[PDB]
Amino acid sequence: MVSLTKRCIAEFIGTFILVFFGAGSAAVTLMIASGGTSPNPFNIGIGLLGGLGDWVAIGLAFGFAIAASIYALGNISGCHINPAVTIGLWSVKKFPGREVVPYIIAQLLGAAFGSFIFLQCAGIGAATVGGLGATAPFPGISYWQAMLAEVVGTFLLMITIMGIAVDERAPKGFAGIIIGLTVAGIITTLGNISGSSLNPARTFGPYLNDMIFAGTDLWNYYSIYVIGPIVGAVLAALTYQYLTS
Amino acid sequence: MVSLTKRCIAEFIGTFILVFFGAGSAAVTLMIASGGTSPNPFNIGIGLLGGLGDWVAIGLAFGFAIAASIYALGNISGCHINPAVTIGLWSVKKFPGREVVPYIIAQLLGAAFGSFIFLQCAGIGAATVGGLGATAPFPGISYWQAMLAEVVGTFLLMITIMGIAVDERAPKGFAGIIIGLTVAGIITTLGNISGSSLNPARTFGPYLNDMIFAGTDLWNYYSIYVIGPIVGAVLAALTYQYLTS
Amino acid sequence: MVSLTKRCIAEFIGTFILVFFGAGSAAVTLMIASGGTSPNPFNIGIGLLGGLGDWVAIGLAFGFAIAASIYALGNISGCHINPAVTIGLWSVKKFPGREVVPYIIAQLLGAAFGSFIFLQCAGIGAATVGGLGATAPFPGISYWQAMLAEVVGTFLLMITIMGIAVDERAPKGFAGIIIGLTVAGIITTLGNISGSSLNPARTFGPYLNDMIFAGTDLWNYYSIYVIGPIVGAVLAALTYQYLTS
Amino acid sequence: MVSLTKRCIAEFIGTFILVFFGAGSAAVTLMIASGGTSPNPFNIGIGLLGGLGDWVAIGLAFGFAIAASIYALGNISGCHINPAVTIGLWSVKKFPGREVVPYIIAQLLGAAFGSFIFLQCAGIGAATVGGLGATAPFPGISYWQAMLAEVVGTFLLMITIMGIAVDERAPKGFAGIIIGLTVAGIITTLGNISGSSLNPARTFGPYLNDMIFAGTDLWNYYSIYVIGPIVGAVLAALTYQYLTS
Numbered sequence: 009m010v011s012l013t014k015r016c017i018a019e020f021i022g023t024f025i026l027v028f029f030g031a032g033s034a035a036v037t038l039m040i041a042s043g044g045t046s047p048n049p050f051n052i053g054i055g056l057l058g059g060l061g062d063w064v065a066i067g068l069a070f071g072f073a074i075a076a077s078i079y080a081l082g083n084i085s086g087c088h089i090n091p092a093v094t095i096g097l098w099s100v101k102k103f104p105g106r107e108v109v110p111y112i113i114a115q116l117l118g119a120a121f122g123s124f125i126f127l128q129c130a131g132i133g134a135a136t137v138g139g140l141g142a143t144a145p146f147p148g149i150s151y152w153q154a155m156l157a158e159v160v161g162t163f164l165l166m167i168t169i170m171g172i173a174v175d176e177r178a179p180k181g182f183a184g185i186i187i188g189l190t191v192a193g194i195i196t197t198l199g200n201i202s203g204s205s206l207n208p209a210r211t212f213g214p215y216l217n218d219m220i221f222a223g224t225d226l227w228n229y230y231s232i233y234v235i236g237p238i239v240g241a242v243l244a245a246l247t248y249q250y251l252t253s
Numbered sequence: 254m255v256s257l258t259k260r261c262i263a264e265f266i267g268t269f270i271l272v273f274f275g276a277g278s279a280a281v282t283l284m285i286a287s288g289g290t291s292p293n294p295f296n297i298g299i300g301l302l303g304g305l306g307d308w309v310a311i312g313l314a315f316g317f318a319i320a321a322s323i324y325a326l327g328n329i330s331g332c333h334i335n336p337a338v339t340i341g342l343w344s345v346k347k348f349p350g351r352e353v354v355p356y357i358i359a360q361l362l363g364a365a366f367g368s369f370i371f372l373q374c375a376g377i378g379a380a381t382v383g384g385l386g387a388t389a390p391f392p393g394i395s396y397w398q399a400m401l402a403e404v405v406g407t408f409l410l411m412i413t414i415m416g417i418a419v420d421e422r423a424p425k426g427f428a429g430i431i432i433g434l435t436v437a438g439i440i441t442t443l444g445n446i447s448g449s450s451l452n453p454a455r456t457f458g459p460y461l462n463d464m465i466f467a468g469t470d471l472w473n474y475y476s477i478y479v480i481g482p483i484v485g486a487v488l489a490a491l492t493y494q495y496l497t498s
Numbered sequence: 499m500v501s502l503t504k505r506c507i508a509e510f511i512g513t514f515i516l517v518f519f520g521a522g523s524a525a526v527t528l529m530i531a532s533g534g535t536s537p538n539p540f541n542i543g544i545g546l547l548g549g550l551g552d553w554v555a556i557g558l559a560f561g562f563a564i565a566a567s568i569y570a571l572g573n574i575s576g577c578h579i580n581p582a583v584t585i586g587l588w589s590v591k592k593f594p595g596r597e598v599v600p601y602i603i604a605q606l607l608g609a610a611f612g613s614f615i616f617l618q619c620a621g622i623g624a625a626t627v628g629g630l631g632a633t634a635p636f637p638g639i640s641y642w643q644a645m646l647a648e649v650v651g652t653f654l655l656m657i658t659i660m661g662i663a664v665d666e667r668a669p670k671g672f673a674g675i676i677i678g679l680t681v682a683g684i685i686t687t688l689g690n691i692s693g694s695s696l697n698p699a700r701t702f703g704p705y706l707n708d709m710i711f712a713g714t715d716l717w718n719y720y721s722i723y724v725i726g727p728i729v730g731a732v733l734a735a736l737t738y739q740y741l742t743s
Numbered sequence: 744m745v746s747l748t749k750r751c752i753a754e755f756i757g758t759f760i761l762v763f764f765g766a767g768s769a770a771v772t773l774m775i776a777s778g779g780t781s782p783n784p785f786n787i788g789i790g791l792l793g794g795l796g797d798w799v800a801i802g803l804a805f806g807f808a809i810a811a812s813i814y815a816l817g818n819i820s821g822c823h824i825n826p827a828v829t830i831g832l833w834s835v836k837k838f839p840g841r842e843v844v845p846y847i848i849a850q851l852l853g854a855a856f857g858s859f860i861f862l863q864c865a866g867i868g869a870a871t872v873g874g875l876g877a878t879a880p881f882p883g884i885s886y887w888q889a890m891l892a893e894v895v896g897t898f899l900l901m902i903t904i905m906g907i908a909v910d911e912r913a914p915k916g917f918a919g920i921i922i923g924l925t926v927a928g929i930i931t932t933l934g935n936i937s938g939s940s941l942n943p944a945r946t947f948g949p950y951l952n953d954m955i956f957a958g959t960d961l962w963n964y965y966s967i968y969v970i971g972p973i974v975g976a977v978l979a980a981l982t983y984q985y986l987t988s
């Protein structure tokens with residue numbers, strides 16, 4: 009109904025909001041905790057002052073921002089704001105393959121830009137101390153461990169999306185808040201393991217800005233936040249297709 | 254349907270509740286943390302004992318109070334309880350320009366009064382230590398940085414409002430809780446940057462009482478919490494008008 | 499529709515749940531924080547380890563328990579589970595004066611019993627250290643300050659109830675969660691001031707058990723948690739009657 | 744409507760998600776707090792860095808995961824994902840006794856597997872330090888105290904389920920989020936007492952993996968997390984049957 013051009017602008021805004029607010033809270037957490045003493049290496053400083061409370065706070069910053077976006081942009085573009093979701097939807101004939109790349113590009117741009125504008129609001133400390141909320145494996149977590157966390161996490165996100173936003177029997181009006189709260193929950197447990205990206209674009213944004221405004225190069229991890237989410241999403245979409253078949 | 258006089262009383266009550274409960278939680282946080290040692294200057298004491306957890310708690314105190322007000326006063330006056338929202342609504346022919354000033358004045362009074370009654374409940378420490386939850390740029394944040402944070406923040410608030418309360422296709426009954434939770438999320442990330450006002454009246458109240466009951470004069474910052482929110486709201490309203498056009 | 503006898507049993511259960519879970523979380527908080535060092539006297543130990551985060555956690559324990567009860571017992575007795583609400587409803591011809599006392603008595607009993615069973619689960623430390631979550635003015639808060647906090651707090655609770663549960667235009671199904679989240683918000687800001695009772699029975703339960711199983715006598719404060727809530731509720735009910743008249 | 748075989752797969756997935764995400768957050772909390780100093784023995788380290796905030800965070804990780812599952816798998820199998828609920832439903836002619844064992848077995852397997860996959864993501868520290876989120880009586884809590892906590896807790900969970908998911912008058916679409924938030928609330932207060940299992944399978948999973956990958960043998964406690972929940976659920980189901988009769 010809405011032109012692909014405007015739906016792409018919407019996806020841009022939605023992913024911008026997602027990275028600005030979600031990743032922003034993570035960065036800010038590290039900034040107000042910087043200089044504190046951690047009990048052990050696993051605690052990189054996010055759960056330093058508020059324990060798991062800090063992780064639920066970050067998860068909620070993501071969740072509420074996501075819910076708000078879905079309610080604001082859902083009717084416009086469907087508010088995927090996540091490459092893995094677009095692909096997941098695509099994998100079960102729920103989204104036109106012809107629009108997959110356009111959306112993904114708008115998502116990637118929005119994420120990059122969202123991370124950039126936040127970096128301007130909070131100063132350079134957000135990048136040099138908060139790392140702009142970039143998702144990377146945590147201390148003691150191997151490459152495949154983070155991979156696994158990302159597929160199980162994105163699996164939950166997608167199967168929830170399938171059940172509450174795609175299935176025709178879903179309760180109207182609940183998709184936005186449920187999808188958001190679900191992400192908040194996944195981040196609460198999987199955050200201190202892989203950072204709980206569940207979104208290739210959510211990771212892309214921070215990575216990019218982190219490299220340009222900091223001598224950082226986290227790209228040797230990106231594959232985790234690309235393959236993991238995509239595999240998790242498609243697995244969920246198909247699984248749900250089978251269970252309701 | 255309801256007389257402008259009663260809808261103004263409603264706006265008064267709604268903004269009173271907003272400042273009393275929201276700004277109140279911020280003040281209280283500083284009061285129970287006063288005397289503690291902070292890791293660095295950025296942490297002014299709000300995330301001292303609970304990290305980002307303290308910010309989500311403050312955001313939720315705002316959010317739940319806002320949701321409650323919208324459900325209690327929405328049918329009466331529309332529950333704008335925010336000058337920027339009234340103006341934003343106005344900017345897209347969704348509110349009578351003739352009532353803009355009346356509402357804004359009721360909002361400003363309610364906010365001032367709300368801050369005043371809270372100051373009486375918690376004693377003068379709420380003002381001399383908690384600063385009554387007044388929003389001011391945080392340590393290391395320049396004037397334009399706070400400005401930017403406020404427009405991006407209010408942009409999200411308004412576009413959400415446009416999508417869930419103004420658009421005729423919005424899910425009935427969700428506006429209240431969604432708008433509230435959205436504010437809670439914005440405050441979680443933008444709080445330790447500009448205090449996350451998003452509301453000229455929410456700032457006015459505390460500023461006023463802070464000056465009268467404390468040798469404080471934060472008015473050299475007020476422009477941030479006036480221009481920032483208004484610009485963000487109007488930008489959001491128009492953007493949403495374009496995307497759905 | 500349901501017999502007064504069964505609706506009284508329901509009120510009993512609902513208030514039992516309210517005090518068991520809500521007041522219980524407060525007690526538990528003090529128990530896991532006991533032995534810690536506080537920054538100042540205002541911080542009695544509740545915001546010691548989690549700052550305001552601890553207050554929102556307690557507020558949510560109350561809120562979620564309240565929402566659950568309203569969804570479980572609402573259709574049975576209306577789930578007042580609060581003398582002030584019953585009276586408030588009564589004050590605007592929304593509840594039979596003939597049933598006011600019966601409900602209030604079931605609420606008082608349920609609260610007393612709820613506090614008693616919790617005391618058995620957590621041991622006597624819940625009473626000697628957690629005080630069973632009894633609401634009393636906080637350090638530096640005078641008698642009238644707590645009084646004021648309780649009327650403003652209960653005012654919000656009731657006007658929300660009026661708007662979302664009594665008004666015929668309210669969105670169906672939202673009353674439970676909204677009422678609950680509203681209480682969670684009031685407790686977040688007003689908790690460290692008066693303990694944020696908003697409910698004569700919620701206070702009665704703990705007070706009683708605290709006296710019987712601890713040399714405590716907080717009854718010289720009870721009037722605050724009786725008059726404050728009742729005045730706040732009636733004021734809200736009438737105010738809402740006027741604004742919608 | 745859906746084959747018992749697919750509904751069993753669903754129950755498997757739902758309980759997997761429940762244990763993976765819920766119990767996972769508890770384990771992670773202990774891992775980021777390990778090495779810290781506790782105020783007293785009651786605080787085993789979960790409320791160490793975030794106070795009660797840590798408990799609400801764990802409760803929410805459970806709640807959001809539970810809500811998401813109910814929205815994703817509810818239409819498929821009813822999403823019991825808890826032996827006590829299946830039995831409770833059974834006890835009031837709301838579920839076929841012939842399917843009770845099948846569901847319970849899928850739940851038990853899912854829980855065991857869910858705990859296993861999480862153990863792989865977070866490394867062995869999740870088991871040797873976080874105990875995989877296994878529920879056991881807390882310091883100073885006797886066997887019958889934990890038992891009581893579990894029946895009162897599961898009583899609330901079930902009566903809420905009865906009111907919002909079983910009763911034909913329940914508001915459509917609210918069951919998922921309400922059931923989830925209710926669990927989050929029960930865990931917030933009852934967690935530091937018995938760990939707040941409310942689910943024989945949620946306990947089984949961790950116990951099993953804890954024994955196999957750690958010299959742990961918590962099975963001398965399991966009866967608490969079997970009898971307690973079942974008794975609480977049945978008591979709630981019958982009580983609700985009586986009150987609405």
Ligand SMILES: CCCCCCCCO[C@@H]1O[C@H](CO)[C@@H](O)[C@H](O)[C@H]1O
Pocket residue numbers: 095098105106107108109238
């Ligand atoms: C990692 C897997 C990504 C899969 C996304 C594939 C997007 C391309 O999808 C293809 O686009 C074409 C037009 O451009 C259409 O004609 C094809 O039918 C469609 O399948």
Ligand SMILES: CCCCCCCCO[C@@H]1O[C@H](CO)[C@@H](O)[C@H](O)[C@H]1O
Pocket residue numbers: 151231
């Ligand atoms: C961009 C192309 C990505 C292809 C996916 C490569 C996955 C292999 O990735 C490698 O796996 C090893 C495990 O044996 C790890 O030890 C290495 O650190 C990791 O980089």
Ligand SMILES: CCCCCCCCO[C@@H]1O[C@H](CO)[C@@H](O)[C@H](O)[C@H]1O
Pocket residue numbers: 340343350351352353354483
């Ligand atoms: C910062 C920008 C604030 C814009 C708010 C403008 C409110 C005035 O708005 C004006 O009010 C008049 C009656 O008073 C009406 O007759 C005009 O049509 C209306 O535009």
Ligand SMILES: CCCCCCCCO[C@@H]1O[C@H](CO)[C@@H](O)[C@H](O)[C@H]1O
Pocket residue numbers: 396476
């Ligand atoms: C009340 C009228 C407000 C007009 C808006 C004025 C905005 C200029 O504001 C000024 O911008 C400077 C940046 O160059 C900052 O360094 C100053 O601190 C700031 O006050």
Ligand SMILES: CCCCCCCCO[C@@H]1O[C@H](CO)[C@@H](O)[C@H](O)[C@H]1O
Pocket residue numbers: 585588595596597598599728
């Ligand atoms: C603190 C104020 C409490 C007011 C509650 C008053 C409850 C009594 O209310 C009265 O009960 C009588 C039967 O018992 C009825 O016949 C009366 O009409 C009714 O007003």
Ligand SMILES: CCCCCCCCO[C@@H]1O[C@H](CO)[C@@H](O)[C@H](O)[C@H]1O
Pocket residue numbers: 641721
């Ligand atoms: C049970 C009957 C209660 C009647 C209400 C009495 C209210 C007066 O209460 C008193 O107010 C004084 C303020 O001047 C305080 O200093 C006292 O501590 C307080 O008890």
Ligand SMILES: CCCCCCCCO[C@@H]1O[C@H](CO)[C@@H](O)[C@H](O)[C@H]1O
Pocket residue numbers: 830833840841842843844973
């Ligand atoms: C701890 C109590 C557990 C009760 C669960 C009982 C499940 C068995 O229930 C029984 O299953 C039979 C078929 O297998 C049916 O024919 C019976 O009617 C049914 O009652």
Ligand SMILES: CCCCCCCCO[C@@H]1O[C@H](CO)[C@@H](O)[C@H](O)[C@H]1O
Pocket residue numbers: 886966
């Ligand atoms: C698997 C079969 C379980 C049967 C339930 C047994 C309940 C008794 O359990 C016992 O109760 C005692 C209290 O007197 C406690 O002191 C013991 O530690 C406890 O194991």
